[PDB]
């Protein structure tokens, strides 16, 4: 029931929550845009990011555990669950202006959840925490059991 976490390598993490598994990646790659995708202003908006209701509370807990402040921090971005491409929930943690303090807080949240956490964010460049639910096209082949078995 309660979530369990693991670190595959320097950019790949996973969370198991209930019957669902989530790919968590930290990188300088983003495919979402505020112009087109869903801004998650309050936790209830996470429902627009995920089909299954059961998978929503784990992401809500994860965001809290990272230190995200729903009242004061910038909104997360996610792909609308109605789209073909699959779940993609994104924290902007760039070591740049307007996200420098936020980014360090979220990274410290990652260090508290994964002891082996590696910071790949270069100063003055974009950096993201990306969540995809295993089984959506957006998780590609990274949730095959050849990957998950190495984590646990």
């Amino acid at each position: 029931e309660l979530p369990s976490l693991c670190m595959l390598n320097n950019s790949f993490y996973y969370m198991k929550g209930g019957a669902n598994i989530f790919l968590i990646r930290v990188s300088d790659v983003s495919v979402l845009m505020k112009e087109y995708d869903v801004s998650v202003y309050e936790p209830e908006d996470l429902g627009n990011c995920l089909n299954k209701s059961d998978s929503s509370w784990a992401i809500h807990w994860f965001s809290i555990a990272l230190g995200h402040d729903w009242l004061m921090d910038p909104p997360m971005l996610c792909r609308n669950k109605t789209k073909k491409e699959g779940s993609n929930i994104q924290f902007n943690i760039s070591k740049a202006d307007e996200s420098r303090v936020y980014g360090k807080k979220i990274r410290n949240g990652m260090r508290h959840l994964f002891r082996g956490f590696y910071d790949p964010c270069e100063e003055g460049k974009v950096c993201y925490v990306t969540i995809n639910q295993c089984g959506d096209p957006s998780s590609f082949e990274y949730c095959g059991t050849n990957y998950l078995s190495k984590c646990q």
Partner: antibody
Amino acid sequence: GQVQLQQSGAELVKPGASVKISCKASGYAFGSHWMNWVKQRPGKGLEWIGQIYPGDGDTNYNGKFKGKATLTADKSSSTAYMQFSSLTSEDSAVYFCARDDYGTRYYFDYWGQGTTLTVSS
Amino acid sequence: TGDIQMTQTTSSLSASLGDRVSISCRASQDINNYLNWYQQKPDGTVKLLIHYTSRLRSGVPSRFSGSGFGTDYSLTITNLEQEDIATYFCQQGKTLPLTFGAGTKLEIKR
């Protein structure tokens, strides 16, 4: 390498017949983008026919082209197809395939060169 | 509701090299800045110039710019060049069915 959409050659078809034209894609993940189709006749602007998502075979049609147009796709050859039924002279036109960006933004970021259909006896 | 009708009230215009021109596009419903501009060359090749009202695609000259909101939109070409001879089409991406304006043909005065 770069994205390319290669459409099949011009077709001459008798009224009442059917024809299937194709759009061969290269340079990107064919299963991860919508392929849209567009009809151009002179002085008739551009008309959106419909779209297919080769990832799951799902289709959406402009109601004006339902039954007229049938969209299919073959992931193994990265090819999208448009089949016309019961052709008439109003179907004489240039037809474009065009892909949407990753994430479905309803802009067409790469276009085929067009296929000219002539319906005539 | 009904399909969104896209109207380019000017079907053709002509201007001198270096002139500034603007091409109007209006929609019959609020399209919330989901408005894209295409350039079709005389040989029929189509290129996306601008998406989301004003976002220039990579490689597109900065002479091209887009403005608008709600129902009313505009493509502006400054410092018109020989290579800009083409027909320009607007397109709404708010909702299906996707719909296009009828096109505005641009020719050079000499």
